[PDB]
Amino acid sequence: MKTYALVMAGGRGERLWPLSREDRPKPFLPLFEGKTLLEATLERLAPLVPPERTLLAVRRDQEAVARPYADGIRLLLEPLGRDTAGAVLLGVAEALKEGAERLLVLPADHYVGDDEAYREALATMLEAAEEGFVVALGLRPTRPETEYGYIRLGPREGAWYRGEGFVEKPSYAEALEYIRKGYVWNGGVFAFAPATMAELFRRHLPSHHEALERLLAGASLEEVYAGLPKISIDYGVMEKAERVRVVLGRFPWDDVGNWRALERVFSQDPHENVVLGEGRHVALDTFGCVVYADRGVVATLGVSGLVVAKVGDEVLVVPKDWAREVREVVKRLEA
Amino acid sequence: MKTYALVMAGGRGERLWPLSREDRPKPFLPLFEGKTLLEATLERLAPLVPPERTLLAVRRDQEAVARPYADGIRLLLEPLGRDTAGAVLLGVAEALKEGAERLLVLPADHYVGDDEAYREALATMLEAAEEGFVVALGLRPTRPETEYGYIRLGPREGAWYRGEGFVEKPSYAEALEYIRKGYVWNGGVFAFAPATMAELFRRHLPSHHEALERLLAGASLEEVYAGLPKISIDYGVMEKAERVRVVLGRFPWDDVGNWRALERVFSQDPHENVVLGEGRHVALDTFGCVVYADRGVVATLGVSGLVVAKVGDEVLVVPKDWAREVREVVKRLEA
């Protein structure tokens, strides 16, 4: 059918310093294969949803870096940061007056290692998105990740599962329990008819339902967005939605939240080193490291389990297990 | 009296990669106080020996980087690498026909932390350089350094000691024994009348005595140097010299052979971090490290005892105890 796709581009990606920049959000970083994640996302989506029917949501102040991507793709400029619920609101507004029968919502800052399997999962989500149902993407957990959201699965109904609950990021021990009980990772992707989300706004997110009505009725985006509460679509809607279906994706997938994600994404023997960037890695008696060299050379001698990331005249050195703490660096610099 | 000074500039300083360059030998690196070691050396020497009477020996292919230093100072361009014995040969040739009564020989790639005490030691060496005597500079060892040469001291005679033997770099355990027995570090500095070195060449280094005669007699530097054997003045002459005196310098001193030397030179609490360069060091839960940032920023998070050196688009990361192995990096790159 007539399906539109909303591609949400966001995230400062402070945990990915020095690669991330003020004017260069996470989605615009040259990572795997030298590609930005947004680049790989659009390429992966093209065969399923044409560019003409694709909406790229980004902050207003990021139009510059994003515009080069708007080739047939339309930019939806977010005046302020209002999370994904705000981006989804804008996507729905467009889908509605575009007459779309289906709206696909996806993040542009994730890694997917099988484009075909990714599309097949999305195709199935579109189908499972019958009257009333909101559909989510799930992934079998490979580790007790504490920064991800999980989804409870009910019995299987053909190509999908009945969604049976959404849980926010748990503690380490709680994540283990989620896994034992058959919980899967929330993949951040959703599929529904525009109307079903409108109705969901009405029931669990009044601010957005009212905003949606006024937008279609000629209200100013700036005005509307300013008075909107900042909330994710997962918490504002998904966790309260009564009719949810889930499709399990079996492709490799990572949110790429921190430098350590590079190692996970490579999916090789842990003790082997992981290198990205156009620069060269000189490794001498070095194991289990993650190295990013935008240019020049990076030499490591007799070290293990470290992240060494060089971009321009900035260098980071941190044990990969403490990758989350990289965000403090930007704090120190700002200070 | 009329004293000339020979300042030997040399050393690739491969152990100081990435700071060292093909066209930038050790002596020309911006290290302590942002100064090159040659810069600090010339400044330290000026009050004792004027620039007019100072000879700066450097390789022929390094004239470019050295010329800026030749302000009243004269360049002695070495056609090939023949060690210090070769540089000393050239220095003696000049001193002789310049009519110098004393020649002071010193390295330009060493750190000295007390210019006045340094000059006072040299002044004393000039005096102790009577007829027949070659004078050396000694320093009380602060650690069993295996890369330095040591000197055996005989009884004290006024302001100096009688030199009683020269030993090349020992093993770790042997260095400890040297220290127990009262051995001191060879500081690399020498003082003698030009004639006494000429006679020393004649007795223990025929190749250089003959070369010296021919040079004064109009032979071509290129020709002469090419057929000269490569040998240090310490091994070729000093270790065989029968009439040696030693002056003990009590200023802080390091040869700055590897990155770890930066820590030794700072001479602070070991656990504190050592930073050089114009760049900024963001330290989070970091201890006992040595950081060099030519520019931009260098952030370390939860690491200890590491050397992180960034110059241009090249970065080095190695535990400071393995600093000597840095030389392998250049080998890998050449390969």
From TrEMBL, chains A, B:
GO terms for biological process: GDP-mannose biosynthetic process. Residues 5-269 form the Nucleotidyl transferase domain. InterPro entries: GMPP_N (IPR049577), ManC/GMP-like_b-helix (IPR054566), Mannose-6P_isomerase_type2 (IPR051161), NTP_transferase_dom (IPR005835), Nucleotide-diphossugar_trans (IPR029044). Keywords: Isomerase, Transferase. The keyword Isomerase applies. This is Mannose-1-phosphate guanylyl transferase (GDP)/mannose-6-phosphate isomerase. Residues 279-333 form the MannoseP isomerase/GMP-like beta-helix domain. PANTHER family: MANNOSE-1-PHOSPHATE GUANYLYLTRANSFERASE. Pfam families: ManC_GMP_beta-helix, NTP_transferase. GO terms for molecular function: isomerase activity; mannose-1-phosphate guanylyltransferase (GTP) activity.
